[PDB]
């Protein structure tokens, strides 16, 4: 119900849980990114067992090519994976 406003605020809320975990509060390192994916998505998404998977994802999210995806880069990875959720979460 036009609840798009609560959805944007929640998307940012989870990001603060991991970004504030380490000094890169305004930036995420492929290392911090792995914790978001492996630890936060314990069962919601296929956990990552090898950091190499994160390195490959870095090629896609490392838009700046610095080995670190900025909070803006992290945000785009959430929209594409959700699209997969539509196939699984078919409302109907």
């Amino acid at each position: 119900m036009s609840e798009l406003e609560k959805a944007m605020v929640a998307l940012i809320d989870v990001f603060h849980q991991y970004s504030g975990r380490e000094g890169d509060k305004h930036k995420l390192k492929k290392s911090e990114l792995k914790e978001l994916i492996n630890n936060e998505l314990s069962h919601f998404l296929e956990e990552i067992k090898e950091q190499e998977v994160v390195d490959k994802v870095m090629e896609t999210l490392d838009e700046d090519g610095d080995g670190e995806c900025d909070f803006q880069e992290f945000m785009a990875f959430v929209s594409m994976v959700t699209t997969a959720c539509h196939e699984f979460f078919e409302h109907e």
């Binding site: 296929e46 067992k49 490959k56 994802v57 594409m80 994976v81 997969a84």
Partner: peptide
């Protein structure tokens, strides 16, 4: 010819998400 199929290895799971890339 010089491409590596790399069949096997559970790591393939990453390719499942690549369908999103696309």
């Amino acid at each position: 010819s010089h491409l590596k199929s790399k069949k096997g290895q559970s790591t393939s799971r990453h390719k499942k998400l690549m369908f999103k890339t696309e």
